[PDB]
């Protein structure tokens, strides 16, 4: 439950998948990592919960809202996460 921040250097793909969001009744969670991708290089781990994306609290977001914030991110991808 300890928190950390990442600022991944672009361009995407960022190297991960999500599950969850409000429309799935679970918090947004890192659900897969591409081997050697940028998220893995920043030691993001499967199961870590995404608390914010670009400073916006992730709690209210749907799955698609989080995906699009990530996909359409200009420059670096800033997120805060909670360790599983």
């Amino acid at each position: 439950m300890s928190n950390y921040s990442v600022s991944l250097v672009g361009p995407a793909p960022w190297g991960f998948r999500l599950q969850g969001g409000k429309d799935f009744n679970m918090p947004l969670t890192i659900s897969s990592l591409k081997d050697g991708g940028k998220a893995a290089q920043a030691n993001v781990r499967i199961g870590d919960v995404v608390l914010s994306i670009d400073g916006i609290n992730a709690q209210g977001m749907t799955h698609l809202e989080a995906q699009n914030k990530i996909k359409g991110c200009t420059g670096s991808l800033n997120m805060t996460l909670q360790r599983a």
Binding site: P13, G15, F16, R17, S32, H63, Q67, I70
Partner: peptide, 6 residues
């Protein structure tokens, strides 16, 4: 719904 790589 589907597996979407980001």
């Amino acid at each position: 719904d589907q597996l979407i790589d980001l």
